[PDB]
Design a protein around this ligand. Structure first.
Ligand SMILES: [Zn+2]
Ligand SMILES: [Zn+2]
Ligand SMILES: [Zn+2]
Length: 263
């Protein structure tokens, strides 16, 4: 069976969450999770809003929780790193500055335009064009950046936009997704299954296709996370994602210590 875990979530150390770190831990324990990894935001030069991370306070707090809850759950100290290749040196210096257990590489902005509801990003742009641009940026990251463990939310672009149906389809993006998935597999990176939109069957379909094609292209490593910014989680969405990962033929989820996969 897949280990019960959450490898993508945010607490008050992230600029867009107010959650108490301890509440994530107690919720995790209450739902039988064996392991969790905090993955707070750092995004360099993010447009319109600071996404900085106080490393001394973050590490001190999670280290305290690790000790407090040692007998009950395994806690890892990770990072969701927004990638922009213009800032590669700053990004690598940041990752290498503290003993992170796990790093997610994510695309949150492209060309100083945030990928979010209401921004320039979706304005006078078809959904298909927004998807094309988003995935091109993801490929750019996978081809040119190495200092991470798992690739975050490939469906991020489907969270937003003026469209009534914001869903992303694998087939409409096949060529670029094959390139991304083949490169992740070749470089021994994990694919994140992100449950944020899993209450929508169209999200399940997209990730089903991602999983099947990743495996066909040599993919081995899968991480699972909620992107929850509060402790209270949608547990049905987590169950759906786990069921899907199993159906696709993956028998384990990847966990990391000091940015090295646990074996
Ligand atoms: Zn956030
Ligand atoms: Zn993200
Ligand atoms: Zn996140």
């Amino acid at each position: 069976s897949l280990k019960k875990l959450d490898y993508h979530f945010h607490s008050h150390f992230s600029a867009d969450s107010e959650e108490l770190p301890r509440k994530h831990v107690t919720e995790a324990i209450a739902h039988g999770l064996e392991e969790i990894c905090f993955t707070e935001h750092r995004d360099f030069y993010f447009p319109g809003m600071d996404f900085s991370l106080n490393l001394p306070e973050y590490f001190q707090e999670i280290n305290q929780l690790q000790a407090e809850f040692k007998d009950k759950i395994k806690i890892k100290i990770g990072l969701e790193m927004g990638i922009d290749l213009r800032f590669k040196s700053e990004i690598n210096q940041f990752i290498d500055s503290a003993p992170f257990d796990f790093v997610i590489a994510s695309v949150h902005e492209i060309g100083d335009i945030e990928v979010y509801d209401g921004t320039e990003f979706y304005l006078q742009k078809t959904k298909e064009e927004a998807q094309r641009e988003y995935l091109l940026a993801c490929l750019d990251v996978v081809q040119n950046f190495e200092n991470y463990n798992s690739f975050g939310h490939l469906d991020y672009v489907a969270r937003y936009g003026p469209y009534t149906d914001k869903s992303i389809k694998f087939a409409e993006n096949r060529e670029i997704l094959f390139e991304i998935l083949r490169a992740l597999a070749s470089k021994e990176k994990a694919l994140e299954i992100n449950t944020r939109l899993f209450d929508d069957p169209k999200t399940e379909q997209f990730y089903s296709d991602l999983l099947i094609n990743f495996k066909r292209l040599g993919g081995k490593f899968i991480t699972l996370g909620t992107d929850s910014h509060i402790a209270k989680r949608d547990w049905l969405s987590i169950h759906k994602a786990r069921t899907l990962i199993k159906k696709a033929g993956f028998h384990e989820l990847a966990t990391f210590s000091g940015m090295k996969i646990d074996k």
